Symmetry: C6
Subunit: 226 residues, 6 copies
């Protein structure tokens, strides 16, 4: 009878195929090749949550400056600068200076406590994982991060990159099993045309729709057809 509570991500059509959206408190992995729409997915999730439910979020990035994210959001019509100025949204800078996972998670926890945020998105933890070559270390650190996020209680959307359209759901192959949920974004080539597909392969402890559902990126956001 009782089921895991879910929070609506307000993405057009995604809540229908997820049967209520992302579970509350669980860390959701999103994997896709370059140009699939991972960062846009996380940004749209955060912005829709902020606008609709008035729930502040914290966006963590490792390979983009906050100004670039603000410009990309302004391209769609999203004014993230106003949200950041008002304190309703916070963007964490962790990129290396062009000139320790404990520190990063401590900073994320401090941001959560200060801004009272209940949504978290990560641009890429693969950049952090590139420090350690061994897959055992990758699994250990990913599990530690997911456990810390579950203890904090924020709904995470960690996005990682994958090399092949069909095959491993990560660069290492271990990130598929550690994360509570995994969502696959595919950008395949068929007949000299690229068609975008969105598929959910697992949602632990709750039902979902299975298979590839096409989604088109428009000027307003991601439009998914259930």
């Amino acid at each position: 009878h009782q089921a895991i509570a879910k929070m609506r991500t307000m993405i057009e059509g995604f809540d229908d195929i997820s049967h209520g959206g992302l579970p509350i408190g669980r860390s959701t992995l999103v994997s896709g090749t370059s140009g699939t729409g991972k960062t846009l997915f996380s940004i749209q999730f955060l912005y829709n949550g902020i606008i609709e439910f008035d729930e502040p979020g914290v966006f963590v990035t490792f390979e983009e400056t906050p100004q670039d994210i603000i410009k990309n959001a302004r391209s769609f019509g999203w004014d993230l600068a106003k949200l950041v100025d008002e304190g309703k949204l916070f963007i964490l800078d962790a990129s290396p200076d062009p000139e320790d996972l404990s520190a990063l998670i401590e900073r994320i926890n401090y941001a959560i406590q200060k801004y009272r945020a209940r949504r978290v998105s990560i641009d890429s933890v693969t950049s952090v994982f590139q420090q350690y070559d061994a897959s055992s270390v990758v699994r250990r650190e990913l599990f530690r991060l997911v456990a810390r996020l579950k203890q904090i209680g924020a709904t995470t959307v960690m996005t990682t990159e994958r090399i092949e359209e069909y095959g491993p759901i990560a660069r290492y192959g271990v990130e598929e099993f550690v994360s509570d949920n995994v969502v696959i974004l595919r950008n395949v080539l068929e007949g000299e045309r690229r068609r975008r597909t969105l598929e959910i392969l697992k949602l632990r402890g709750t039902s979902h729709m299975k298979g590839e559902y096409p989604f088109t990126i428009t000027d307003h956001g991601i439009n998914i057809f259930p």
Copy 2:
């Protein structure tokens, strides 16, 4: 004339294709990609045994907290919290703290002696095996664990993860031969749709039905069509 005794797992339709279910006292491997239904298979096996035959079980987990397992079971309608409180079911915690195989097998044996349990399920021994990179060490440790479980006399269902839908029956390729039985769970993609299949490739010392039999995961459990 004489055959190996079998215990019914009470999974809908699985006993028909297994010709009596899992053999008694032998360790059964279950391999499947992410989202195939391995942990659900082991949990349903334990819970059906507990409810029907009143045989206590011990569930060993390495990547999930017991609370998460309880919530996932409650999603299906299974009240594992009551069973744990009554002492009829015990869940062993071996996950690393986010802050030696001899010890683990000793603890499992102690749990078996204390709770008088005759069924054992393992969430993932691959997490333990990730410590040792060499496949020889993996084979040695897996054989030691299987031999210890056979000496104890509990019916084990060890579940391990595999990378490719078609190919090795383990991440290493050695776990197919060491384990007494192997069961393959496949989640293939065909025509933008995912169809789940269940296949048994070997049951040493007893007959079985061979080939892919589709199984659908419903709110009550795993429904397999023989």
Copy 3:
């Protein structure tokens, strides 16, 4: 005119496709994936020889206890316990304790001398070969073992495991050429059904039938259609 003498293995239909069965005194390799019927093939060879020609055999195992082999044989109706008690069959234990190739071959020779056996079967020498990673060491040890078995004069059936259904005839790719004969057991999947095939690719110094011949495992043994 003169040809290599052959001994009948009494397996249903195999003697027709082998043109007289295994050659006398030569070590025959049998390679197949998990669940193909390698151990059953060797056990049926030994038991049929013992029952028909009254020739004692020695079965060497590395990953199974003798009790498990006895139970598996009793499943088919073969009472190996009586044969072991009468001294007509001997099973050698070489598995590692869960708590040097010279020693193993010396023990096999001693068993041959004591029991006057003229048939030998090996469950898996791949378990021994896993100690040495280099393929040169594998080839050297395999050649030494085959030469020792030829000097002893017993008809060996060494069974090794292979990973892919189509491809190398061993985990290393060197065991195909060192062994005097090689027999391929295949368990392929086609249209969600598994069909078993038996093929002989070489029999040095004698003719044979070439190609895949289906064989079905029944409660009495292996039934092969020539």
Copy 4:
């Protein structure tokens, strides 16, 4: 409403499929196998910019002498020697003598300051990256270079080589995600004929046309059909 400003590259038909050309200030990756037209693409970009918008450019090369580039351009009818003499175009020599990324970026910045150039093209940074085998070092150095170029404010077109026509968008697989934009040049073989295709897979923060658009290299330049 507001979008990222774009500068026209004046390549025939490319501005139609890019929806305004390359974004201003962002580093665009161009990946293609040998003989696809990467160096010709960068040279045509620079020369068209210089002729039309009177914007000086700086071409950085690592595997070709400036004389070879001048001869190749003269083949098409482009007189780069006059532009270099007049100071409107500068070619940077970084090739190893046949007899430190900080120095290279410092020299590029000095050239930008001296010649007041607002367009930059790179023949191959893969030659520099070949010094470091690890992909983490490649990602770090590529990100540092892209960040420095963004801080300078010049519109870069970095071209890197790829091995397979279908597969990774770089020799390492990491250069697809670090770069702000990626453009794929393909030279495929079908029916004993080679057909050239141009495809853009991502343009962060702006829309584009997706899919393979054939382009033919003529004596005047690259002719692309939108």
Copy 5:
């Protein structure tokens, strides 16, 4: 006008597709998977030469005892024991004892001088090459052996083993280019049937027929259809 002199191998039909047989004095490589007919090819070459042209030969073996070769030849009807006793044929033993390339080539040269032999066959030099893992060492040693054989003046048929039916013409991929000639023996599986094919891919300095020509192994020898 002038061409490289050739010696007939007297194999049924092979001289037609080779346009005169193997060139005189050049070392011919023969590569094929297990069970293709490499050792039989070399033995038939030597025996046909001895019987027809009365030219003594020297057979060098590394993985078979001379007695096994004699028995295998007697299977076809070839009495190599009489030839060895009469001194018209010599078999060199180089296999490791089950209890330095300079020495081997010195022994081969001594055998050539003593028996006045003008034909040489090698069972497998891959067994020797397995000592050195690096492909550069393999190429160097193979070139040294071929140069020594050319200086001696004997017509060599070196046979090496290959793993895949389609792909490299050697286990290393370097033996295709060093050897003066290469002949490919294929044992492919198509529709559950094995069909044997013989193909010559290069004969330096002379013409040949190209493509796969089926050959069947009969009780008298190799029967090839040109």
Copy 6:
């Protein structure tokens, strides 16, 4: 208007598909599997140049003795011995004795100065590159050699070997980009028949015909159909 000057190679039909032949002064790579016709291509290029334009050439070889090259040429009807005796052609010996790139290039330069030769062919630089395993060292040495040859001013035809018919244009994958031009020789198998194809994938700074053009090796030379 102005284009790169070209010299006719006088190969039947190749000048039509190359639009004037090889460029003057640039080093042309020729890659093909064993038995494709690389050495024959270089020898025919040199001999046709010598006979028609009276331009002396220098042939550099690493795996063949000059006598073998002379015999192979005499097979086609080419009397290279007379040319070598007259001093119109010089063959450089660099093969290792069966009993430093600076030295080799110095010797080639000395030969060019002594014989006033304006054409150079190389049998295989891959033999030299096998000393260094790393691909960075291979690229560096290949670039140094090509730069030295460009400074000398001789028209080079460097031939290297490739493993797969379809795939990398070299054993390492780096030789495709360093060389000024690359020509692919393919010997494919289709329907048990081998058909030879010649394709040019790039000619920097000049136009060419693209695609696979069949070429047949006859007793007089290479006959290519444009």
